[PDB]
Design a protein around this ligand. Structure first.
Ligand SMILES: CCCCCCCCCCCCCCCCCC(=O)OC[C@H](COP(=O)([O-])OCC(O)COP(=O)([O-])OC[C@@H](COC(=O)CCCCCCCCCCCCCCCCC)OC(=O)CCCCCCCCCCCCCCCCC)OC(=O)CCCCCCCCCCCCCCCCC
Ligand SMILES: CCCCCCCCCCCCCCCCC[C@@H](O)O[C@H](CO[C@H](O)CCCCCCCCCCCCCCC)COP(=O)(O)OCC[N+](C)(C)C
Ligand SMILES: CCCCCCCCCCCC(=O)SCCNC(=O)CCNC(=O)[C@H](O)C(C)(C)COP(=O)(O)O
Ligand SMILES: N[C@@H](Cc1ccc(O)cc1)C(=O)O
Lengths: 458, 80, 110, 98, 178, 128, 124, 88, 67
């Protein structure tokens, strides 16, 4: 699959050789072309994966993730060029270089055939994200956010590395196909328990799991808009993809090692949904929303059924699109009024009607209105959990009630009521912002038209 | 369009329940200085209104006449 | 129920629009003569809602009451159903009496 | 009781200004300067959609099994079948409780 | 809504407000006009029975007892005018109210329609710009050294002055904007 | 004379039923005057910027900034581990987890025991 | 219902239980009993697709009414004789059920009284 | 359509119409500038009743703080006109 | 159709509205009377409700308190 990797590496010098006032145009055009090329990976088989070479392969789980990454790059470029107008040419090129390097690392991460190569790329994604956050964030807290983003990740991933090399000394291979075909059960010993924890905790902190999630509100609030987009839409899904890959060697230990994580996921989903009800910062609300949806995904991965895996795949794709759109919507208001307080600017439907329509559609997809793929993933996970235990419908049910509430709360706070009298600098929406919202939302409904493309290998 | 208010001096409480209210208040040494402001609610085309039963049987007479003539026709239509 | 319930709501809306968007029945006086067609429609709708014989509401509500009477059923539920079908006529009477009978109680600019 | 002279005067001045502002909201006769068959509803809104739906149902939907399933017609004594021509006998000599 | 409030209400103000509230709730109880007039005259007699009490302590005790009786006997569902804070049309037309500064952001093609209106708007903006500094100076002069003590504003006093802080009061959207 | 109204947290005491406003002192009048003076000073400061013709943007409110900061960033620096804080943290952060763990473990053990005995009625149970 | 007042307030021993009814053999008091015949065949009722609850001993009249309704479609006021016949059959069925209830009540009360009287005679 | 566009003359006519139906005010002696307390010799309770009668006439409520200050028919007419955006 | 405000008088009424209201009230009452004349059993009941006490023991098959 070098036909996708090489054009991004070519985006790099194309950006660094462009004329000073053509960087955005060229980057956007060729990013969109690369997304169009990557669209061909959706032609998948029913039996095995597309094994391109000894190094790269494509499954029915990673292809929609690659398509989402390549589609998110142009949207990030469109969202970034407004607040970077005053920047120097070299620093703008460096920012675009960070975005391109992040895309390259993600593309290679989602298609690596070996687990150590996957680990190396999945750690390599850290550097551009940290640089973006700590260099182009707006407030002084960004520095702290960066630290919280880094060590929380590494404290999870350093044990995993050890486990990985240990496994290669035991079975002789880390190739995923060999690992799947030559699978052997895990006995019930303390050594196996700690191997399970080492294999699981890095992905758990990536999702993130409730209790290990404190880095996420900081990092996703303090980051620039493109950073928040790529953190919510793609980088959270690394944990889910890695967990679904790694669980093939953890049976039957998972059968009882999942209980603390299942309890944490369900109760913390309720807790983060409740937290969303009392939030003064609009970005923090969206971050805690991401935490709740990812708790659902964790439950789906932990119960290990075909329906739960399909639901997890659909939910990851849908959440990526929806959360990126919500972050962009909040960023428009922030750029207008330079404040993230939700109750500062009210009654925006009177001043910006089309943006209010975009807000309504985004909040409708957040609460999983049928037949959106958000609802499809949520319903598949809920059905699988009901099969796992009939009592789960209580907690899941409560979540469905809370989500809508806070979702509509957000809308009602920003669009309805009366406008703030002293805010007189609310200009009409630009074509760029409307196009960004449309390019977020139209693929969601188009995917609803054909849902088997995001349902995964199961 | 281009209509004026009626003369204010035609509004009298005479012949209205407001008269009864005034007579009852005068037995207590009191007075009601706002009755003429309410006299229009009883004065003109609002003077009388039907009762609940009278309202329920609004179009009963015409309906009964039609029913009677139809039944009379029916009874002497089977004589064919 | 769809027919006469929609008609009753439409008659209420007609009254509200006539009296400058007023919705309180305590400020609606004698509309029996001032609003003849609305009065006729509301009276017919109230009679249909109360299951008056051979109207639309009769052919469902009357059979429902008879079926509730003649079944092996909870006795308290039967009693509450009968009390509720009395209260139906009661509140229909309230609407008609306060909105259409008597003397006007709306502002003088008619 | 009542307004103080300062409050009264400020009210008069604000009232004059407000009445001027409300008068200025009126439109002059040219203000909206704009810059530069009978039964066709039944054809474009009933006939064309019904043509498309009938084509789609007749030649595409019913090209696969069990896509349009109708419950079987009721059969009563004394009926005759259209396909086979078989007739159904009568009903067991009613006791005639006249 | 228009008048600046005082630091406190006086005894007479409280009595009058209680009188108005009691009459309104009694009208809510007495639906018919003649009955309401009768009981309103009775209420007025009851109110002016103790009008000439020279002992202020007894007056406030009577007011306290009257307010307790009102709270016991209030109508749970009193009549509210439709546009009053509890009415059915209280804030119905707030979504149609658009601030005037939005007109500054219209595209020139939109402003090509309505030329005379926008010329008048330019005249009003010129007047506001010319008056602002004089308004500020007058407020600076008339304000006591320890800051203002009420929310009352002064009128214009000079030859061609305008009352200070007039723009947002004069350019209210409307009561029925659209 | 009449039945008494007693206030609660979610249905508070009316002003006209408040004893404190029926027995007043000149000190109370002075306090009310000071309160109105503070409100008037704030109102003038706001209205001076609100009516400014050269003012474009957002009139920053220090009270809103203080509220959001107190709700977000001032909480941890003012936290002390106390018996109340420790007990409430332990309860509301641990008790629900073990409650739900016990519930789910009991339910799944019962279901598994039923499945081993072969009496669960799993007919037509194809999808999971 | 008065039967409800008799059962709930009076002696419930002599009152029939609707759920447990009858308690006496169908040929206990009668010398011989005719078997309640059926006119409609199972196949006819299946072809008419009546309902599982309308397939009672009056199903033939219902089948006739349905056929007449289908034949006289636009004239929806032509099936009066058939509807009346079906109603009469259902009325006779309800009357028979009432007769069964009264028979059960009389049998219960008489049997209890006769047993008590025999025991009382044996007690002296 | 809806209600006609209320004018200042109509408002003044209705205010005077209400005031001449009050039994405590002499019709001839009443003018648009007459003070309720000084010219007409009424007390505060009568003023409250007058304000309530105005509220009933025009179908909207006048808050107590604003209603206390109105003392002649002209102030009432001006307050109503200002409330309802009447300029002609 | 133009109908102007009245200010404390009875509103203006057109003949058509009264005609329509009277006609529809009359037709409702005619329908009620006609349907009662033709379908009285729908209200008063069609079949006689029997009194169980008047059933002899011969048809109910209870023995004469001996066996
Ligand atoms: C169901 C009807 C089917 C109609 C057939 C054709 C439909 C074509 C629609 C194509 C996709 C819509 C485009 C999305 C962007 C919105 C457009 C926009 O930006 O506005 C500018 C445009 C310009 O107008 P304007 O004068 O400038 O005013 C703009 C103002 O801002 C204010 O503007 P506004 O006040 O007019 O509001 C804008 C509008 C637009 O906002 C929206 O909400 C539209 C987006 C849909 C909601 C997204 C989340 C819900 C998840 C469901 C996903 C469904 C997708 C299915 C596949 C789609 C394929 C792409 O919002 C609404 O009017 C109310 C929304 C409530 C919708 C409730 C229905 C829920 C689902 C019900 C059935 C859905 C499945 C159908 C099959 C089921 C089994 C038979 O606005 C419009 O023209 C009106 C929009 C039309 C409303 C469409 C709502 C129904 C369609 C739902 C999905 C389509 C299914 C088609 C399959 C056949 C059935
Ligand atoms: C803030 C959120 C962070 C992320 C959450 C991560 C969740 C990690 C929780 C680990 C889940 C279970 C771990 C091990 C499985 C069983 C643990 C033990 O309690 O079970 C019994 C174990 O028995 C006793 O409990 C011995 C263990 C007691 C010592 C462990 C210390 C736990 C105290 C709590 C410390 C907090 C740890 C987390 C720090 C943050 C079972 O009896 P036994 O059959 O014999 O053991 C099975 C293993 N065998 C078969 C090899 C023998
Ligand atoms: C719905 C049912 C509930 C309602 C029940 C209400 C029961 C309360 C009835 C009795 C209440 C009273 O009389 S309380 C009696 C209070 N009496 C006094 O305060 C004496 C001093 N007089 C004055 O303050 C002024 O003269 C003043 C009276 C304000 C006139 O104001 P003006 O002359 O300057 O216009
Ligand atoms: N894992 C599933 C994915 C899928 C879902 C729906 C489909 O229609 C097709 C495929 C297989 O089977």
């Amino acid at each position: 699959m070098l036909k996708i990797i090489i054009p991004t590496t070519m985006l790099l010098p194309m950006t660094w050789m462009s004329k000073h006032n053509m960087i955005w145009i060229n980057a956007t055009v060729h990013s969109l072309l690369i997304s169009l090329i990557s669209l061909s990976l959706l032609n998948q088989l029913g039996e095995n994966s597309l094994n391109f070479s000894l190094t790269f392969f494509s499954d029915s789980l990673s292809a929609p993730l690659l398509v989402l990454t390549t589609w998110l790059l142009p949207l990030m470029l469109m969202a970034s060029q407004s607040h970077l107008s005053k920047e120097t040419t070299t620093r703008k090129k460096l920012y675009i270089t960070m975005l391109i390097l992040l895309q390259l690392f993600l593309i290679m991460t989602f298609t690596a055939t070996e687990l150590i190569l996957f680990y190396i790329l999945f750690e390599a994604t850290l550097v551009p994200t940290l640089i973006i956050i700590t260099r182009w964030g707006n407030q002084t807290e960004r520095l702290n956010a960066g630290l919280y983003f880094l060590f929380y990740t590494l404290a999870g991933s350093l044990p995993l590395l050890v486990a990985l090399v240990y496994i290669q000394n035991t079975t002789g291979s880390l190739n995923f196909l060999i690992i799947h075909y030559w699978s052997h059960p895990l006995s019930n010993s303390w050594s196996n328990i700690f191997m399970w924890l080492a294999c699981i905790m890095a992905f758990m902190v990536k999702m993130p799991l409730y209790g290990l999630h404190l880095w996420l509100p900081k990092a996703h609030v303090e980051a620039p808009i493109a950073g928040s987009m790529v953190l919510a839409a793609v980088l959270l899904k690394l944990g889910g993809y890695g967990m679904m890959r790694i669980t093939t060697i953890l049976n039957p230990l998972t059968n009882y090692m999942a209980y603390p994580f299942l309890m944490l996921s369900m109760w913390g989903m309720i807790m983060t949904s409740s937290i969303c009800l009392r939030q003064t910062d609009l970005k923090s609300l969206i971050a805690y929303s991401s935490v709740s949806h990812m708790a659902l995904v964790i439950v789906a991965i932990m119960i290990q059924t075909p329906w739960s895996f399909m639901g997890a795949t659909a939910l990851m794709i849908a959440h990526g699109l929806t959360s990126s759109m919500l972050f962009c919507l909040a960023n428009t208001n922030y750029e207008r009024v330079h404040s993230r307080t939700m109750i500062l600017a009210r009654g925006l439907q009177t001043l910006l009607p089309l943006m209010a329509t975009w807000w309504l559609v985004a909040s409708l997809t957040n609460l999983a209105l049928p037949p959106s793929i958000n609802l499809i993933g949520e319903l598949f996970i809920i059905t699988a959990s009901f099969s796992w235990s009939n009592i789960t419908i209580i907690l899941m049910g409560m979540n469905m009630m809370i989500t809508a509430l806070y979702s509509l709360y957000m809308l009602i706070t920003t669009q309805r009521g009366k406008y703030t009298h002293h805010i007189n600098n609310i200009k009409p929406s630009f074509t760029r912002e409307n196009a960004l919202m449309a390019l977020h939302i139209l693929p969601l409904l188009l995917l609803t038209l054909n849902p088997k493309m995001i349902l995964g290998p199961l | 369009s281009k209509m004026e208010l009626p003369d204010y001096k035609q509004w009298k409480i005479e012949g209205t329940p407001l008269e009864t209210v005034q007579e009852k208040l005068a037995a207590r040494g009191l007075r009601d200085p706002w009755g003429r402001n309410e006299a229009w609610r009883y004065s003109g085309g609002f003077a009388n209104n039907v009762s609940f039963v009278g309202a329920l049987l609004k179009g009963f007479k015409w309906g009964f006449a039609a029913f009677v003539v139809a039944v009379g026709a029916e009874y002497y239509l089977e004589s064919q | 129920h769809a027919f006469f319930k929609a008609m009753l709501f439409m008659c209420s809306g007609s009254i509200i629009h006539s009296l400058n968007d007023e919705q309180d029945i305590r400020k609606m006086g004698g509309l029996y003569k001032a609003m003849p067609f609305t009065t006729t429609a509301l009276i017919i709708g109230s009679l249909a809602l109360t299951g008056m014989p051979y109207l639309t509401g009769f052919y469902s509500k009357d059979l429902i009451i008879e079926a509730v009477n003649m079944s092996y059923t909870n006795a308290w539920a039967l009693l509450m159903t009968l009390i509720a079908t009395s209260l139906t006529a009661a509140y229909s009477t309230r609407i008609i009496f306060f909105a259409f009978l008597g003397k006007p109680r709306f502002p003088p600019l008619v | 009781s009542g307004y103080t002279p300062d409050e009264k005067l400020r009210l008069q001045q604000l009232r004059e200004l407000r009445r001027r502002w409300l008068k200025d909201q009126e439109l002059s006769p040219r203000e909206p300067v704009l810059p530069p068959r009978h039964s066709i509803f039944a054809v474009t809104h009933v006939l064309i959609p019904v043509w498309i739906i009938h084509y789609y149902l007749k030649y595409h939907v019913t090209a696969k099994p069990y896509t349009v399933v109708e419950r079987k017609p009721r059969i009563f004594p004394g009926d005759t079948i259209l396909e086979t021509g078989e007739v159904i006998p009568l009903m067991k000599e009613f006791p005639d409780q006249h | 809504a228009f008048s600046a409030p005082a630091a406190y209400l006086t005894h007479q103000q409280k009595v009058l407000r209680l009188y108005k509230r009691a009459l309104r709730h009694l009208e809510s109880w007495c639906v018919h006009r003649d009955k309401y007039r009768y009981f309103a005259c009775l209420m007025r007699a009851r109110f002016d029975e103790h009008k000439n009490e020279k002992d202020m302590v007894k007056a406030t005790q009577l007011l306290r007892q009257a307010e307790e009786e009102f709270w016991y006997g209030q109508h749970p569902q009193p009549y509210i005018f439709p546009e009053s804070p509890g009415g059915t049309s209280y804030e119905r037309y707030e979504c149609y109210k658009v601030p005037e500064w939005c007109l500054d952001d219209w595209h020139p093609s939109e402003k090509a329609m309505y030329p005379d209106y926008f010329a008048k708007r330019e005249q009003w903006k010129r007047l506001r710009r010319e008056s602002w500094e004089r308004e500020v100076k007058q407020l600076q002069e008339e304000t006591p050294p320890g800051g203002p003590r009420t929310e009352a504003l002064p009128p214009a006093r000079k030859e061609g002055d305008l009352p200070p802080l007039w723009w947002h009061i004069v350019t209210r959207p409307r009561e029925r904007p659209m | 004379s009449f039945p008494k109204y007693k206030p609660s947290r979610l249905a508070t005491l009316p002003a006209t039923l408040d004893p404190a406003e029926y027995d007043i002192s000149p000190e109370t009048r002075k306090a009310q005057a000071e309160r109105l003076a503070i409100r008037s000073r704030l109102k003038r400061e706001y209205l001076l910027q609100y009516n400014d013709p050269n003012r474009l943007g957002v009139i920053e409110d220090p009270a809103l900034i203080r509220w959001t900061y107190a709700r977000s960033a001032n909480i941890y620096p003012n936290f002390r581990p106390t018996p109340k804080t420790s007990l409430l943290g332990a309860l509301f952060g641990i008790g629900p987890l073990f409650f739900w763990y016990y519930v789910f473990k009991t339910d799944r053990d019962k279901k598994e025991k039923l499945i081993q005995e072969g009496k669960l009625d799993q007919t037509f149970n194809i999808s999971y | 219902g008065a039967h409800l007042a008799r059962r709930y307030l009076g002696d419930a021993s002599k009152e029939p239980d609707p759920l447990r009814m009858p308690t006496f053999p169908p040929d206990y008091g009668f010398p011989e009993r005719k078997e309640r015949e059926m006119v409609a065949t199972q196949q006819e009722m299946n072809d008419a697709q009546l309902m599982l609850q309308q397939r009672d001993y009056c199903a033939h009249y219902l089948i006739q009414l349905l056929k007449c309704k289908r034949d006289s479609f636009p004239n929806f006021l032509a099936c009066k004789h058939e509807q009346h016949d079906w109603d009469y059959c259902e009325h006779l069925d309800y009357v028979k059920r009432m007769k069964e209830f009264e028979r059960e009540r009389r049998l219960l009360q008489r049997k209890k009284r006769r047993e008590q009287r025999e025991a009382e005679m044996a007690r002296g | 359509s809806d209600a006609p566009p209320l004018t200042l003359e109509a408002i003044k006519d209705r205010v005077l119409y209400v005031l001449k139906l009050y039994d405590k005010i002499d019709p001839e002696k009443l003018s648009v500038n007459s003070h309720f307390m000084k010219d007409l010799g009424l007390d505060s309770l009568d003023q409250v009743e007058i304000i309530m009668a105005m509220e009933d006439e025009f179908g909207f409520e006048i808050p107590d703080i604003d209603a206390e200050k109105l003392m002649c028919p002209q102030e009432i007419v001006d307050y109503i006109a200002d409330k309802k955006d009447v300029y002609e | 159709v133009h109908i102007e405000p009245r200010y404390r008088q009875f509103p203006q009424l057109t003949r058509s509205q009264l005609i329509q209201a009277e006609f529809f009230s009359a037709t409702m009452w005619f329908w009620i009377l006609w349907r009662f004349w033709h379908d009285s059993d729908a209200v008063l009941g069609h079949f006689p409700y029997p009194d169980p006490s008047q059933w002899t023991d011969e048809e109910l098959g209870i023995l004469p308190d001996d066996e």
